[PDB]
Design a protein around this motif. Structure first.
Motif, mmCIF file in Angstrom:
data_model
loop_
_atom_site.group_PDB
_atom_site.id
_atom_site.type_symbol
_atom_site.label_atom_id
_atom_site.label_comp_id
_atom_site.label_asym_id
_atom_site.label_seq_id
_atom_site.Cartn_x
_atom_site.Cartn_y
_atom_site.Cartn_z
ATOM 1 N N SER A 151 -4.282 -6.860 6.728
ATOM 2 C CA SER A 151 -4.205 -5.395 6.780
ATOM 3 C C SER A 151 -5.364 -4.782 5.992
ATOM 4 N N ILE A 152 -5.531 -5.226 4.749
ATOM 5 C CA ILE A 152 -6.535 -4.682 3.814
ATOM 6 C C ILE A 152 -7.994 -4.838 4.293
ATOM 7 N N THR A 153 -8.262 -6.011 4.926
ATOM 8 C CA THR A 153 -9.600 -6.274 5.471
ATOM 9 C C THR A 153 -10.033 -5.235 6.508
ATOM 10 N N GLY A 154 -11.294 -4.833 6.371
ATOM 11 C CA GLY A 154 -11.935 -3.860 7.280
ATOM 12 C C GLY A 154 -11.788 -2.416 6.782
ATOM 13 N N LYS A 155 -11.303 -2.291 5.555
ATOM 14 C CA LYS A 155 -11.076 -1.000 4.889
ATOM 15 C C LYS A 155 -11.921 -0.983 3.611
ATOM 16 N N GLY A 156 -12.062 0.208 3.026
ATOM 17 C CA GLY A 156 -12.830 0.375 1.767
ATOM 18 C C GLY A 156 -12.306 -0.546 0.653
ATOM 19 N N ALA A 157 -10.994 -0.729 0.649
ATOM 20 C CA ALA A 157 -10.267 -1.538 -0.345
ATOM 21 C C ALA A 157 -10.440 -3.063 -0.225
ATOM 22 N N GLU A 158 -11.119 -3.527 0.835
ATOM 23 C CA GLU A 158 -11.292 -4.977 1.068
ATOM 24 C C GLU A 158 -11.945 -5.724 -0.106
ATOM 25 N N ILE A 189 4.266 4.922 -4.741
ATOM 26 C CA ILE A 189 2.801 4.933 -4.610
ATOM 27 C C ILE A 189 2.219 6.127 -5.389
ATOM 28 N N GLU A 190 1.606 5.798 -6.521
ATOM 29 C CA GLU A 190 0.891 6.815 -7.303
ATOM 30 C C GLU A 190 -0.601 6.631 -7.160
ATOM 31 N N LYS A 191 -1.304 7.688 -6.836
ATOM 32 C CA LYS A 191 -2.753 7.631 -6.592
ATOM 33 C C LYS A 191 -3.481 8.715 -7.384
ATOM 34 N N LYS A 192 -4.454 8.234 -8.158
ATOM 35 C CA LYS A 192 -5.276 9.101 -9.007
ATOM 36 C C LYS A 192 -6.719 8.631 -8.953
ATOM 37 N N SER A 193 -7.561 9.506 -8.420
ATOM 38 C CA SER A 193 -9.004 9.209 -8.330
ATOM 39 C C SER A 193 -9.536 8.914 -9.739
ATOM 40 N N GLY A 194 -10.556 8.046 -9.776
ATOM 41 C CA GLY A 194 -11.126 7.577 -11.043
ATOM 42 C C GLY A 194 -11.131 6.049 -11.010
ATOM 43 N N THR A 366 -12.925 5.517 -6.478
ATOM 44 C CA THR A 366 -14.032 6.446 -6.764
ATOM 45 C C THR A 366 -13.858 7.854 -6.159
ATOM 46 N N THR A 367 -12.785 8.054 -5.389
ATOM 47 C CA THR A 367 -12.521 9.325 -4.679
ATOM 48 C C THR A 367 -11.035 9.468 -4.314
ATOM 49 N N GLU A 368 -10.642 10.739 -4.184
ATOM 50 C CA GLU A 368 -9.304 11.143 -3.703
ATOM 51 C C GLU A 368 -9.033 10.598 -2.299
ATOM 52 N N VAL A 370 -10.368 8.128 -0.847
ATOM 53 C CA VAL A 370 -10.376 6.655 -0.873
ATOM 54 C C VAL A 370 -8.986 6.125 -1.242
ATOM 55 N N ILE A 371 -8.422 6.658 -2.328
ATOM 56 C CA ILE A 371 -7.095 6.228 -2.810
ATOM 57 C C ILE A 371 -5.984 6.614 -1.820
ATOM 58 N N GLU A 372 -6.245 7.658 -1.036
ATOM 59 C CA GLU A 372 -5.312 8.132 0.006
ATOM 60 C C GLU A 372 -5.227 7.125 1.157
ATOM 61 N N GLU A 373 -6.390 6.624 1.558
ATOM 62 C CA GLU A 373 -6.480 5.593 2.600
ATOM 63 C C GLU A 373 -5.951 4.233 2.132
ATOM 64 N N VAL A 374 -6.163 3.959 0.842
ATOM 65 C CA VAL A 374 -5.651 2.726 0.216
ATOM 66 C C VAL A 374 -4.112 2.757 0.223
ATOM 67 N N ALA A 375 -3.571 3.951 -0.028
ATOM 68 C CA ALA A 375 -2.121 4.206 0.022
ATOM 69 C C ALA A 375 -1.587 3.984 1.436
ATOM 70 N N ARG A 376 -2.274 4.492 2.433
ATOM 71 C CA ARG A 376 -1.911 4.226 3.840
ATOM 72 C C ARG A 376 -1.949 2.730 4.187
ATOM 73 N N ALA A 377 -2.984 2.062 3.676
ATOM 74 C CA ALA A 377 -3.187 0.616 3.891
ATOM 75 C C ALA A 377 -2.008 -0.206 3.349
ATOM 76 N N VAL A 378 -1.523 0.212 2.175
ATOM 77 C CA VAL A 378 -0.359 -0.442 1.574
ATOM 78 C C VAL A 378 0.951 -0.098 2.299
ATOM 79 N N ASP A 379 1.069 1.151 2.726
ATOM 80 C CA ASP A 379 2.271 1.609 3.449
ATOM 81 C C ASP A 379 2.506 0.718 4.673
ATOM 82 N N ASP A 380 1.404 0.300 5.277
ATOM 83 C CA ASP A 380 1.422 -0.607 6.438
ATOM 84 C C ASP A 380 1.740 -2.050 6.061
ATOM 85 N N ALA A 381 1.089 -2.522 5.011
ATOM 86 C CA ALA A 381 1.273 -3.879 4.506
ATOM 87 C C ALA A 381 2.737 -4.153 4.108
#
Lengths: 513, 114, 114, 57
Positions: A151-158, A189-194, A366-368, A370-381
């Protein structure tokens, strides 16, 4: 007989018009179908803009004139009410299925045959899916890591797919308890840019976006004893209207000292329990904060009622109404309660819980966005890991099912013979639209890919094929952990066929002007 | 630039319209194609009756309006001048061949390849 | 399917029209861009006079007809809500960036690449 | 700029000739330029993402 102005089509004219209208709509929406499907921008006569992929929304908003096109709109709405998903799929598949079916009508194959053949092949398709499905250990560590990592592969989070796949499998496994039903509500799922994505982590506890209300409170507590109260710690008053009737100066002091004792007794009782952390649902008077602080008790006020319940579940504290009822058995455990700054903002960490039934995955990036898409990536996983835990069955994708079905149905067709074989043959040929649009939407050669894949699949097997849109070549689907639940495909076929059967049943169309 | 009243289609719109018009004509004549092909009876606005199988005759006699359909009529006439037979065959086969060819275009296979 | 009176553009026609409309607006405001940028005087049908450099204000006050031009107006408003400044900059830069990008499209460079 | 360097160039609109930007103290914050690019690109990306335009009459 009919009012002048009314228009009527019948027989083959009614059929031609209805099919054609449905087909054109299908061509309009089919460009959204699939993982590589795109979206449309619809701007009404007023200026309002809607950008969506939903078939119903697109069709609901647009202003149709033709009666036959208006009748198809009802199909899309019923699809939504009955099944939810498959709106675009059902329309597109239904159109082609009807087109291919009419080719049989022109050959003089009674429509009762065509519809029966489709029904029969469709029911057999579900059996074949159950048969080819590859059974796995629901809680197999290694295969789970493949689901996650794939799931994670092919995303910014890879960049940190290994660590992330680990935390994700662990989070689900912890909250699932038995083997198994999962409630994704226990994974926050808590997401905070930084920071970066590398900093992402799993916390066997909870991360609350609050602060310690008072400055004088301890900044660190070890082996904390947390108390969860929902009653306000104020001076209670009777429901019945009451008032003190002072008649002597001695009473001016008598009552003041009485209210002071009541207040002190309240606070004193909390401390007496051994609690060093307190979550109150209502308010906390300033004076109470002062005493709480002096006792080195950490307190939080004005907590949401829904949060009070989530806090009970997570921390394992029992909400008590009357302080009189509180006992040591109602206390919850947290290995650590600490104030941390994350991207400057102060947050509370409840970590190192014994056996937490609710966990949080703090995401960094590094961005809002980015962490939003990472959250979606996990929601799927979490989703796909959940699917495998409940149904210990997996299956190759890339249109491998439809190819297996096409093969076996063709042989079955020969066994049945007669005209009915033509109907089952057409169902098998109809299944190819999936491979066709998978590679079309991907921008791969649909003809060449299908020829290469099917050949390779026939040689290397079932777990050594599929299409890999990312590399644009055959692979090992199993080795790459590119699997989907059987339920996805099974439900898709079921709901799809029931809609097609409704259309196939119509032998008379009467549309007013 | 163009006189108001002139209509123009271009790109994929010009292609869609042209193909579709040609295909519908092909479906109309294809019922005559082959040893087991049947004939049509065309009765003009005057009462005259023509019963034939010839593609040119059917298309020559009928009164077409659409410009794209009028352009295909030229195909049928050139087929007659050049080869004689294959008028119906060429139209029907040409239509399906073009339809199947466009499926390749949608797949992004350069028409020079097809 | 669509009510007579509705107009539709698609594919390269939808793209050509949208880009061109955006570009012309960009040319109108670009004269204000920069430290040496100048101002405009807009006098409505009522007599009221507004003299400004703000892209939103100029576009909000003017009375546009074309739907494609009305859709670009939303860009200017979102730019103001999100960032505040860069309204004129974003429109002008966005126009040229889109123009130069289309030169790549004509060369057959997938827009996902650009 | 390629010859004299980075702090020995720029345009000086006032004299209409190259100068020393640093010597003349003609500087701006990095944040001006950085934010300008950021917000600018995010708007361009929105336009670039559109592959379908449907405008009513």
């Amino acid at each position: 007989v009919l009012p002048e102005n009314m228009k009527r089509y019948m027989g083959r004219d009614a059929q031609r018009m209805n099919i054609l209208a449905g087909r054109i709509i299908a061509e309009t929406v089919r460009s959204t179908l699939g993982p590589k499907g795109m979206d449309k921008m619809l701007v009404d006569d007023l200026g309002d803009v809607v950008v969506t992929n939903d078939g119903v929304t697109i069709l609901r908003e647009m202003s149709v004139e033709h009666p036959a096109a208006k009748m198809l709109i009802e199909v899309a709405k019923t699809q939504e009410k009955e099944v939810g998903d498959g709106t675009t799929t059902a329309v597109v598949v239904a159109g082609e299925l009807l087109r291919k079916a009419e080719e049989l009508l022109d050959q003089n194959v009674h429509p009762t045959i065509v519809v029966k053949g489709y029904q029969a092949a469709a029911q057999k398709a579900q059996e074949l899916l159950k048969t080819i499905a590859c059974e796995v250990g629901a809680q197999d560590k290694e295969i789970l890591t493949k689901i996650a990592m794939t799931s994670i592969t092919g995303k910014g989070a890879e960049k940190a797919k290994e660590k992330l796949a680990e935390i994700i499998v662990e989070a689900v496994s912890a909250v699932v308890d038995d083997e198994g039903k999962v409630d994704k509500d226990l994974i926050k799922i808590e997401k905070k840019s930084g920071a970066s994505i590398d900093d992402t982590e799993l916390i066997k506890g909870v991360l609350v976006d609050k602060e310690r209300v008072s400055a004088q409170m301890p900044k660190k507590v070890t082996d904390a004893k947390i108390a969860l109260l929902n009653c306000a710690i104020e001076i209670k008053e009777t429901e019945t209207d009451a008032e003190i009737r002072i008649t002597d100066p001695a009473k001016l002091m008598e009552f003041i000292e009485q209210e002071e004792k009541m207040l002190k007794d309240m606070v004193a009782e909390i401390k007496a329990s051994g609690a060093n952390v307190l979550f109150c649902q209502k308010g906390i008077d300033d004076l109470a904060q002062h005493y709480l602080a002096k006792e080195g008790i950490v307190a939080a006020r004005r907590v949401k009622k829904s949060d009070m319940e989530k806090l009970a579940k997570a921390t394992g504290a029992n909400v008590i109404t009357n302080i009189k009822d509180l006992s040591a058995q109602d206390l919850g455990d947290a290995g650590l309660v600490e104030e941390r700054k994350i991207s400057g903002d102060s947050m509370i960490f409840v970590e190192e819980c014994k056996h937490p039934k609710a966990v949080t995955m703090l995401i960094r990036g590094t961005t809002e966005h980015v962490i939003e898409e990472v959250a979606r990536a996990v929601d799927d996983a979490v989703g796909v890991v959940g699917c495998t835990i409940e149904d210990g069955r997996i299956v190759s994708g890339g249109g491998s099912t439809e190819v297996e079905l096409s093969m076996k149905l063709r042989e079955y067709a020969e066994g049945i013979s007669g005209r009915e074989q033509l109907a089952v043959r057409a169902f098998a040929d109809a299944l190819e639209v999936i491979p066709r649009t998978l590679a079309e939407n991907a921008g791969l050669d649909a003809i060449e890919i299908l020829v290469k894949v099917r050949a390779a699949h026939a040689s290397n097997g079932n777990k050594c094929a599929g299409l890999n849109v990312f590399t644009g070549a055959v692979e090992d689907m199993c080795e790459n952990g590119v699997v989907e639940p059987l339920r996805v495909k099974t439900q898709a076929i079921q709901s799809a066929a029931e809609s097609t059967e409704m259309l196939l049943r119509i032998d008379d169309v009467i549309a007013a002007e």
